[PDB]
């Protein structure tokens, strides 16, 4: 037997659709999609953040022991395209949670943290210029 099974796995990803959740369109939300997310999405440091962390594929079996509120721009992007949010604040907080998770899990000076820092800086610039 020797506990070679059951195996590890990834959690279910964060929801991208919730029919009973209040939602609306606001000019701020439209710009977070049109401008903010879309310019981040194509940055060369975007690729680790474009989908939920695959702990299996990436050999990070500890990831979901440490990170309990996962978040990624793939999820944020779908939430925006689905009009899932009530205000800009909810969307921004997802972005914050994503950056914060990366800082929590890794060490300062790790390459991944430098990737997040760069995106976060760019994020914050684009954020200053909100309607
Ligand atoms: C948000 C995704 C993420 N957060 O912390 C990570 C750590 C990673 O490997 C150490 C990896 N693995 S990786 O293969 O995507 C990766 C990315 C960058 C890196 O340094 C440049 C090393 C591994 C991903 C993450």
Curated annotation (Swiss-Prot):
The gene is BRD4. The NET domain mediates interaction with a number of chromatin proteins involved in transcription regulation (NSD3, JMJD6, CHD4, GLTSCR1 and ATAD5). JQ1, a thieno-triazolo-1,4-diazepine derivative, and I-BET, a benzodiazepine derivative, have been tested on tumors with success. Treatment with GSK1210151A (I-BET151, a I-BET derivative) has strong effets on mixed lineage leukemia and promotes myeloid differentiation and leukemia stem-cell depletion. Chromatin reader protein that recognizes and binds acetylated histones and plays a key role in transmission of epigenetic memory across cell divisions and transcription regulation. Remains associated with acetylated chromatin throughout the entire cell cycle and provides epigenetic memory for postmitotic G1 gene transcription by preserving acetylated chromatin status and maintaining high-order chromatin structure. During interphase, plays a key role in regulating the transcription of signal-inducible genes by associating with the P-TEFb complex and recruiting it to promoters. It is linked to Cornelia de Lange syndrome 6: A form of Cornelia de Lange syndrome, a clinically heterogeneous developmental disorder associated with malformations affecting multiple systems. It is characterized by facial dysmorphisms, abnormal hands and feet, growth delay, cognitive retardation, hirsutism, gastroesophageal dysfunction and cardiac, ophthalmologic and genitourinary anomalies. CDLS6 inheritance is autosomal dominant. A chromosomal aberration involving BRD4 is found in a rare, aggressive, and lethal carcinoma arising in midline organs of young people. Translocation t(15;19)(q14;p13) with NUTM1 which produces a BRD4-NUTM1 fusion protein. It comes from Homo sapiens (Human). It comes from the Eukaryota. Changing residue 111 to G: Found in a patient with a neurodevelopmental syndrome; uncertain significance. Interacts with p53/TP53; the interaction is direct. Interacts (via CTD region) with CDK9 and CCNT1, acting as an associated component of P-TEFb complex. Interacts with RELA (when acetylated at 'Lys-310'). Interacts (via NET domain) with NSD3, CHD4, BICRA and ATAD5. The interaction with BICRA bridges BRD4 to the GBAF complex. Interacts (via NET domain) with JMJD6 (via JmjC and N-terminal domains); the interaction is stronger in presence of ssRNA and recruits JMJD6 on distal enhancers. Interacts with NSD3. Interacts with NIPBL. (Microbial infection) Interacts with bovine papillomavirus type 1 regulatory protein E2. This interactions may serve for the tethering of viral genomes to host mitotic chromosomes allowing successful partitioning of the viral genome during cell division. The record marks 106 as: Acetylated histone binding. The chain holds residues 44 to 165 of 1362 of the full protein. It is found in: Nucleus; Chromosome. This is Bromodomain-containing protein 4. Residues 24-130 form the Bromo domain. Ubiquitously expressed. Belongs to the BET family. There is a cross-link at residue 65 (Glycyl lysine isopeptide (Lys-Gly) (interchain with G-Cter in SUMO2)). Phosphorylation by CK2 disrupt the intramolecular binding between the bromo domain 2 and the NPS region and promotes binding between the NPS and the BID regions, leading to activate the protein and promote binding to acetylated histones. In absence of phosphorylation, BRD4 does not localize to p53/TP53 target gene promoters, phosphorylation promoting recruitment to p53/TP53 target promoters. Transmembrane segments: none annotated.
């Amino acid at each position: 037997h020797h506990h070679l099974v059951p195996r590890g796995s990834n959690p279910p990803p964060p929801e991208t659709s919730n029919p009973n959740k209040p939602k609306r369109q606001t000019n701020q939300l439209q710009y977070l999609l049109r401008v903010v997310l879309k310019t981040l999405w194509k940055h060369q440091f975007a690729w680790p953040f474009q989908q939920p962390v695959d702990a299996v594929k990436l050999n990070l079996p500890d990831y979901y022991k440490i990170i309990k509120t996962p978040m990624d721009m793939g999820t944020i992007k779908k939430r925006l395209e689905n009009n899932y949010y009530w205000n800009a604040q909810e969307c921004i907080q997802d972005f914050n949670t994503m950056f914060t998770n990366c800082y929590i899990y890794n060490k300062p000076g790790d390459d991944i943290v430098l990737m997040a820092e760069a995106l976060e800086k760019l994020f914050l610039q684009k954020i200053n210029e909100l309607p």
